[PDB]
């Protein structure tokens, strides 16, 4: 967000100084676009940015901002092709969290029910289909009202900006 005055000349260690003052744990707009792009085209079918963090945390014990470092190191080492095995994608996340490990300096059944519940969820869907009933219509309408609300709330906010509390009240 904050452009120093000589971006093109002020050296990289000296720019990281200026940027550190104003930023904290923010993965940023441009980096958040780059990590979901790396996850989408390079990760095997089904392997989300969601799944890739639950693996980094389960098998390599990484919290919110520490798995943010492992994703940023994988973004600089992004595969030039999509990984095939989910085990190839797991092995990729492994070596990427150990390149982060020595760049930061730190060393390193309900699932049965999960398979069944999936089944029921589908039995639901197909049934709803037959019934021709829209399960998502609630949230549709809701999201639309939520919009018109910030909209009205907005104009009201403005009128108050112009007239003030005392006058409006």
């Amino acid at each position: 967000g904050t452009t120093p005055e000589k971006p093109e000349e002020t050296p990289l260690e000296e720019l990281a100084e200026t940027f550190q003052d104003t930023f904290s744990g923010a993965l940023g707009k441009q980096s958040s676009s780059l990590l979901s792009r790396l996850i989408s085209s390079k990760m095997p079918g089904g392997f989300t940015i969601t799944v890739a963090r639950k693996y980094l945390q389960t098998r390599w014990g990484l919290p919110s901002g520490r798995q943010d470092g492992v994703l940023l190191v994988a973004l600089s080492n992004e595969p030039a092709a999509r990984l095939g095995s989910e085990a190839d994608a797991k092995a990729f996340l492994d070596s990427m969290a150990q390149k982060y490990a020595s760049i930061v300096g730190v060393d390193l059944l309900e699932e049965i029910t999960k398979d069944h519940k999936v089944l029921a969820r589908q039995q639901l869907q197909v049934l709803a289909r037959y019934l021709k009933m829209d399960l998502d219509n609630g949230e549709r309408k809701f999201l639309k009202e939520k919009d018109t609300v910030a909209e009205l709330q907005a104009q009201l906010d403005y009128l108050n900006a112009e007239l003030g509390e005392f006058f409006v009240n």
């Binding site: 923010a26 940023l72 730190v106």
Partner: peptide, 7 residues
């Protein structure tokens, strides 16, 4: 592990 922000 001790949760660190990104640098």
């Amino acid at each position: 592990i001790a949760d660190e922000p990104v640098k």
